Ligand binder design. Structure first.
Ligand SMILES: [Zn+2]
Ligand SMILES: [Zn+2]
Ligand SMILES: [Zn+2]
Ligand SMILES: [Zn+2]
Lengths: 444, 444
């Protein structure tokens, strides 16, 4: 159950590349507790499979390096995340972000694109709803639009992930449309759910006016305000918040759509590792210092949430690892994995100090990026990068001739620290996670 | 509890896809033992990363199914297997079979293509060599030619994995060549190593005659006979072997090159999931029933070896998962993974009964194959397959424009069962495995 897993010394020497300093048995035994968890922090790396973790560690920490956050969780396993074909009820081997998020948030598999409903389109209670009912404070943070599938899945039940605001819901989710007697769009359901802390992007959908209900005629932003939400839009105002609860829930909208990525780098290109020079990532100039980082949002949320005596449930998402993978941009993708790692560190620090917090880090599904040899002549998009080791690493994206690289169906890493973390070991399913969390918090 | 990880019931219903029956904590706590391992069985799936495991599970057992061998090991983790650049000593992100096998068998990183030597070309003792010196019985089994990198790394120290027999060694490993005062070719060093049980293919190199030494002029096969090796060529003859020890070592040569693969299927093709119908694998008609399977070899080895009072070390390899992956042949690859699972079952059956056996299952490195959506338009080679779920699964090979798909550098799964199995949990390095085994057995 060690906390340092970097190579011991000279990687060219016998025992120099070892990450273990001694026998794990006793330490591992010491880290196994079935006592209840008072708090739960679930961090999700959207599209962050074992390959994405390996490529980012290699680049930012070196092959023999180690992520202080991501690599430091002691109990590890692999889990399945296949979705279901809506018509046949048969497995669909490659899930989208919607079906997987619904799986761990409700405990039931579903079809790609479904948010909070099963294949029969019937609603099921999310872990956040249950937490909130039991008295626990709740948080939902992401670097994506708050309407994005992952944060959405905890607070909305729609038949199609595209039902962002009133206008799209009427056309695509008529059965959920407010005017038609439904629960409403994702954004409307988010506002109704009222998690104590909610932070991310997606301010543009809040400019839509409701078509019905008690607040028809007013923009979703006007409604938020009208219903007691504290609205912050940058790091400064985010930091000046001193409390967030059911009387004053916090809602931060730091971007119109998705928040900007941390690093800039060119897009992989065909034979890019051969015909183009190796690249070194640089900071994204389009990203203002006023836009809080994932670690900052995570830290503020933890502070506001831990004020609750009963406990809290918090979900944090590093969204753009997935987005940059789709875009075949190694620097964008790696920068986002580094960003997530910082957030994991904040979580682990609190968890170790507090002692009754279960921390889980995993991804919703695998993705395209592969690490290949320097001289690889590949059919897809490639790019050579200068790593921290002073060596060249080539990344390949070879599963799509279209303008977006695809998710993949491989089982991937799930790691945890704290009470009930043992339930993450061995092979499990993404739906087992819902139950693991439900049982750790003693939720009925 | 920890033995059954199949979906519980109806995968479309809440809790239906769950693999866990209850809380793992106490069960996991019970399996943590730091007492000495009397025996060690290391099973290697060449090129068998998490993707390959998922593809084969989905196909053979369905998405919610589970491998009775491969998926039944309770302690799991992920490990790194990067090699080293010979000139610079900097990490080489994508290893080959030779550099990786050397890392787990000697405990030191090395350059791609090296067997039993570090980047300075200095020999280091293997775990088999140390087991043999300590009085334990030793076995080396593989479905590849016995000169293949993986089995070879346990008994040979050469600067190039190409140094199969006398001729190749003369021109590629002059400093190892017998005529120039070296230890000899891989096959010669193998014969010198004298493990109690050695089973595999690669009979063609044994037809070579030694150039120098005590047996110059005689084929290596005759030399084998001259030194007291019992030679078997088929299942019937293997089965009649009563004992195998230092005075009557067993040498099984089941094929000229690599042993034949179990399943047959066409090679993936460009837009194959689109232009060609789904395929269903069938048994290989060219495979002679007289050729033993990996589980039959594994089983017999365990039977001969366990006769040794002190203990035994046995390495088992399913080589063709890798070869078929290079060849972009889904059915060949999956069938070899199914073949390995049966061997893992035989090992675990013995281990659970015996009680002092550490069983480890992992791969040397990751590979090319990805599971993609049915409608994917990929730039590489694809193929649709009809799974056990009656659903279509598409596999993609998109990292090479050559006639061979390439390895990938992603960290991958390592799972174990038995005394000291906790040393496989969390993030480790492929070289840590060497130390885990040496420690479990109490070597040095
Ligand atoms: Zn996703
Ligand atoms: Zn995606
Ligand atoms: Zn290999
Ligand atoms: Zn290979």
């Amino acid at each position: 159950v060690l906390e340092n897993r970097a190579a011991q010394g000279n990687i060219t020497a016998p025992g120099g590349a070892r990450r273990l300093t001694g026998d794990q048995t006793a330490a591992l035994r010491n880290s196994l507790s079935d006592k209840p968890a008072k708090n739960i922090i679930l961090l999700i790396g959207d599209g962050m499979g074992d390959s994405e973790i390996t490529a980012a560690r290699n680049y930012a920490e070196g092959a023999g390096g180690f992520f202080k956050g991501i690599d430091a969780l002691p109990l590890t396993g692999q889990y399945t995340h296949y979705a279901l074909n809506k018509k046949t009820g048969k497995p669909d081997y490659v899930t989208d972000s919607a079906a997987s998020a619904t799986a761990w948030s409700t405990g039931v598999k579903t079809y790609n694109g479904a948010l909070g409903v099963d294949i029969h389109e019937k609603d099921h209670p999310t872990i956040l709803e249950m937490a909130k009912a039991a008295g626990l404070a709740t948080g939902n943070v992401s670097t994506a639009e708050l309407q994005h599938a992952t944060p959405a899945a905890l607070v909305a039940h729609v038949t199609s992930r595209k039902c962002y605001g009133p206008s799209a819901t009427s056309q695509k989710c008529p059965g959920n449309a407010l005017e038609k007697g439904g629960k409403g769009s994702i954004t409307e359901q988010l506002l109704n759910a009222r998690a104590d802390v909610t932070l991310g992007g997606g301010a543009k959908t809040f400019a839509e006016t409701a078509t019905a209900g008690e607040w028809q005629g007013k923009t979703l932003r006007e409604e938020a305000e009208a219903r007691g939400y504290q609205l912050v839009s940058d790091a400064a105002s985010l930091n000046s918040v001193t409390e967030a609860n059911q009387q004053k829930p916090l809602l931060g909208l730091f971007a119109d759509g998705n928040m900007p990525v941390r690093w800039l780098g060119p897009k992989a290109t065909y034979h890019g590792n051969i015909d183009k020079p190796a690249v070194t990532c640089t900071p994204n100039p389009q990203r203002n210092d006023s836009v809080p980082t994932l670690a900052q949002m995570t830290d503020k949320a933890i502070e506001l949430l831990s004020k609750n005596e009963k406990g809290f449930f918090l979900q944090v998402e590093g969204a753009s690892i997935d987005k940059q993978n789709h875009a075949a941009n190694p620097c964008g993708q790696i920068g986002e994995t580094v960003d997530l790692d910082e957030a994991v560190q904040r979580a682990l620090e609190f968890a170790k100090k507090e002692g009754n917090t279960l921390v889980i880090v995993t991804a919703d599904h695998a993705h395209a990026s592969q690490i290949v040899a320097p001289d690889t002549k590949a059919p897809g998009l490639t790019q050579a990068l200068n790593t921290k080791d002073g060596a060249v690493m080539v990344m390949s994206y070879g599963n799509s001739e279209e303008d977006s690289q695809e998710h993949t169906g491989s089982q991937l890493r799930i790691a945890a620290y704290g009470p009930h973390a043992a339930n993450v070991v061995g092979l499990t399913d993404q739906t087992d996670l819902f139950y693991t969390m439900k049982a750790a918090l003693g939720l009925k």
